Design a protein around this nucleic acid. Structure first.
Lengths: 117, 150, 140, 56, 110
RNA sequence: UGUAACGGGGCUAAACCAUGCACCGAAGCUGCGGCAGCGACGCUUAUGCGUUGUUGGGUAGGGGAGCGUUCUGUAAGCCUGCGAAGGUGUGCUGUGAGGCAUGCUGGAGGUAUCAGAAGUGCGAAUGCUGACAUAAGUAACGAUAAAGCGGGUGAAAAGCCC
RNA sequence: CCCGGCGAGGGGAGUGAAAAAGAACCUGAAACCGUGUACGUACAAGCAGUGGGAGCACGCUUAGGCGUGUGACUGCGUACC
């Protein structure tokens, strides 16, 4: 029954964890972090692996607007014309080939232009 | 303990204190904190816990165990080393050297290596029924009705 | 496998004479940010670490189009909250290329973070074709 | 007032730049081969050649 | 490695011994007295008789060259533990420390 | 007491109101994983696995379930001076106390069975027994009021001594 | 045996399994420290982050995006009870 406070006490704190720095003296390397505050290290990603994505969305669509602007084919205002066709939905990521494909991608907007434009 | 109570002094005049009682069961030189009471308690058993199908293990095992043979006289005893040769009718050689009979004979020499306290005479002591290979009850029909404890 | 593009340091700089100076100034000083970052050059890293090289030509032409021009102040009080104040206005200060009436990007990268290394890459030499002190190789 | 904030860590223990020293040179000169100092000719009797102060 | 003649035991804190130890490393040893014996603090005097009695061994005691034993480190530890009292407050401040000093010299060569 | 009422920068229409349209889009229902509770089904039934319904933040209360530094016991029983083992950081493993191993090591030791419940699972008792990482080069350094050399000597003299 | 202050401590011998048993006699981490392999770096913001990743002291690979940590850019925030 004698306890002597041990076994599991240095265990719940580091062991194998591939984290060498940690919060310095009176926040951590003394003792103080080990039980109630070592959970914090995921909590900046515990909701956001969703919410972060909004930042980078302008990358992939860049390749269908930067030159297409001077042709008037404006992202938000092209998209109503396009979506009139029920097989043409998933333009989101699948249009990104436009970054190298330019010299024969120039044709793509001919397909329905008579009525589209 | 001998230690100076009860309290010695008035703890003020530092703007830092909390304790000073000395004993108090907590701090140094002592002791057992829990009332210092002698926990002497006979944890009592009831009469028909013995009668009481407790004896019924020999129908659980039935193939290796109670080893029904002959009563105890066969032992030497001044060379008890020899009884390994004679313990072959039960086959057992040395495993758990009991016989669980009814009378005063030379067979107490059995416990020379530890084994168990032997007991023998009528009360077979229930902590000898759980959980050994050789529950030997070996003597005759002296089991009729309340006699089954024996 | 990654969709990301760091450093990039700086891979797309688009060396351009920003002639829009005065004649549609308050339309494109608002979006010199989105140019350094984007709208053409958006194809790599349109939020993080990057650099640009836009070419300055004039400064004292702010145009600005409202009553704001002859009664909006600017304040720095650079030492001990100033005490004794200042009260010059927008078409009177713009006479001097200073730090608040001419860069625009001051107000759009508005604290210093991400802005902390890209102060004078646009040179801010001002004085038309007599003052083309910019890049010798061929700017657009 | 009593000690009531951070230890001598990093920005306190660092402080060494003006605690500094002179990395001075020294003259070999076999006219006084080991009782000598960096130019000062003998640390005790005040020598050069003959009978100076209390030398020879 | 070659020699490690640390001395004991001082009256100062390990800080006072710490301030001159760093100069001597790897491009000086041929004339290792001057710098210390011109900087005559009770500090540098210790480190001065640490060095002599070390390298005067190494040239007789291995058989190496007095000139090339470069002096590759010089580090410092305290201890174990020494106390006294000076009754300023006579139950509070009152107990003055003596941290000691010994200089793990660690010589080796060019 | 630094212009400081959207957070800015005020935008002459980019707006302000009405009418069209598709992008952004909290943890908010969707992709499709795993599944504790109280219910209904196909059957099974010592009972359980999936289907189907209600649905999965948890200090007042009542349910009802995992494990240990080792003591008292599983066991002259098998294990180890061919290492039985920590501080440690090989490799994956549980829904978890944490391990079955292990990696580099130590130099005597164990419970993968279940019987056992109480010196009973610690960092906050304004800490305590003995401490000191700490307050810097931490006295007014012992009032500020005294000193001048030539020496004799020596393991080293502001002092010893002439 | 060898140096130094007719000293302290070590560098090899050595009774010795051992001096990581050496008489500040415990086979043995803890508060705090010194020289260093490389980092970040004398325009600092906001519990000093886990992300997302350039290439760097070093290491394995018939080339195969990994085994390694201070942590350029900045994103997310307020860890307590």
């Amino acid at each position: 029954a004698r306890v002597k406070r041990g076994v599991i006490a240095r265990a719940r704190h580091k062991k194998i964890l591939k984290q060498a720095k940690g919060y310095y003296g009176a926040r951590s390397r003394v003792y103080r972090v080990a039980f109630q505050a070592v959970i914090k290290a995921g909590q900046y990603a515990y909701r956001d692996r969703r919410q972060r994505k909004r930042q980078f969305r302008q990358l992939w669509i860049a390749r269908i607007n930067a030159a297409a602007r001077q042709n008037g084919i404006s992202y938000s205002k092209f998209i109503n014309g396009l979506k009139k066709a029920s097989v043409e939905i998933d333009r989101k990521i699948l249009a990104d080939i436009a970054v190298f494909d330019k010299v024969a991608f120039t044709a793509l907007v001919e397909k329905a232009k008579a009525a589209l434009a | 303990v001998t230690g100076s109570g009860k309290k010695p002094w008035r703890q003020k005049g530092t703007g830092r204190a909390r304790s000073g009682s000395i004993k108090s069961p907590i701090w140094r030189s002592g002791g057992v904190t829990f009332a210092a009471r002698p926990q002497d308690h006979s944890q009592k058993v009831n009469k028909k816990m013995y009668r009481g199908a407790l004896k019924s293990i020999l129908s659980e095992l039935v193939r290796q165990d109670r080893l029904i043979v002959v009563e105890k006289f066969s032992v030497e005893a001044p060379k008890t080393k020899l009884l390994a040769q004679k313990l072959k009718d039960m086959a057992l050689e040395d495993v758990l050297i009991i016989t669980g009979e009814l009378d005063e004979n030379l067979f107490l020499a059995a416990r020379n290596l530890h084994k168990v306290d032997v007991r023998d005479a009528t009360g077979i002591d229930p902590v000898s029924l759980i959980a050994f290979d050789k529950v030997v009850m070996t003597a005759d029909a002296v089991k009729q009705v309340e006699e089954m404890l024996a | 496998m990654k969709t990301f593009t760091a450093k990039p340091e700086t891979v797309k700089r688009d060396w351009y004479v920003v002639d829009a100076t005065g004649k549609t100034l308050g339309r494109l000083a608002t979006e010199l940010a989105r140019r350094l970052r984007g709208k053409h050059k958006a194809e790599y890293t349109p939020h993080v670490d990057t650099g640009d090289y836009i070419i300055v030509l004039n400064a004292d032409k702010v145009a600005v189009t409202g009553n704001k021009r002859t009664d909006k102040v600017y304040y720095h009080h650079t030492g001990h909250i100033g005490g004794i104040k200042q009260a010059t206005f927008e078409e009177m200060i713009a006479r001097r290329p200073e730090r608040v009436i001419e860069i625009a990007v001051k107000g759009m990268l508005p604290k210093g973070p991400l802005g902390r290394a890209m102060f004078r890459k646009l040179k801010v030499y001002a004085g038309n074709e007599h003052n083309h002190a910019a890049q010798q190789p061929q700017v657009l | 007032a009593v000690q009531q904030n951070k230890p001598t860590r990093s920005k306190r223990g660092m402080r060494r730049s003006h605690d500094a020293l002179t990395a001075v040179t020294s003259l070999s000169v076999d006219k006084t081969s080991g009782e000598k100092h960096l130019r000062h000719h003998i640390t005790a009797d005040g020598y050069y050649r003959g009978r100076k102060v209390i030398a020879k | 490695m070659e020699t490690i003649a640390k001395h004991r035991h001082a009256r100062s804190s390990a800080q006072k011994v710490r301030l001159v130890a760093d100069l001597i490393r790897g491009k000086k040893v041929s004339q290792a007295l001057d710098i210390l014996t011109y900087t005559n603090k009770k500090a540098a005097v210790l480190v001065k008789k640490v060095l002599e009695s070390a390298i005067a061994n190494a040239e007789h005691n291995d058989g190496a060259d007095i000139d090339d034993l470069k002096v590759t480190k010089i580090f410092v530890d305290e201890g174990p533990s020494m106390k006294r009292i000076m009754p300023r407050a006579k139950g509070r401040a009152d107990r003055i420390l003596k941290r000691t000093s010994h200089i793990t010299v660690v010589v080796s060569d060019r």
